[PDB]
Amino acid sequence: SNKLDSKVSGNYNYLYRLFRKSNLKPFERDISTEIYQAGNKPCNGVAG
Amino acid sequence: GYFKIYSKHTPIDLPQGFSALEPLVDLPIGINITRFQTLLAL
Amino acid sequence: IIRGWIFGTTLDSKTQSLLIVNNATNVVIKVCEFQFCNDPFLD
Numbered sequence A: 001s002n003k004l005d006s007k008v009s010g011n012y013n014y015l016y017r018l019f020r021k022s023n024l025k026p027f028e029r030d031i032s033t034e035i036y037q038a039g040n041k042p043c044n045g046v047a048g
Numbered sequence B: 001g002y003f004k005i006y007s008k009h010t011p012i013d014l015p016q017g018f019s020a021l022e023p024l025v026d027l028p029i030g031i032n033i034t035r036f037q038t039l040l041a042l
Numbered sequence C: 001i002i003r004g005w006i007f008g009t010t011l012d013s014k015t016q017s018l019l020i021v022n023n024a025t026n027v028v029i030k031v032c033e034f035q036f037c038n039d040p041f042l043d
């Protein structure tokens, strides 16, 4: 698919994630887009 | 990944005896279920 | 009294929850994200 989606400086609608709280069960829908807290600090917005 | 529904109709605390629940429908969707609800009427 | 059962992981329309309602002549089954409040319908 190098002929259709390959475009520099654009097409930022496809969004991937890497880390969350728990390992969720297989074939489960991904809806939630709240941030993970670091545990040591009370993360609420931009954190450390 | 398969929704199995087993039912058995018996004319009658749970009453004593035994009745093997026969499969009614098998719905081929594989939707994820974590909690479940019940509904009543008035 | 009981005329159906509704299953799903969320009460809102965030995911495709399952809906089985029972009627007097047929059963309608659709897993397609209806909104659900705290109070079920009482007919």
Ligand SMILES: *[C@@H]1O[C@H](CO)[C@@H](O)[C@H](O)[C@H]1NC(C)=O
Binding pocket: C013, C014, C015, C016, C031, C032, C033
């Ligand atoms: C309907 O849209 C919602 C959010 O837009 C989505 O979570 C759900 O899976 C959709 N229902 C389908 C594809 O049946």
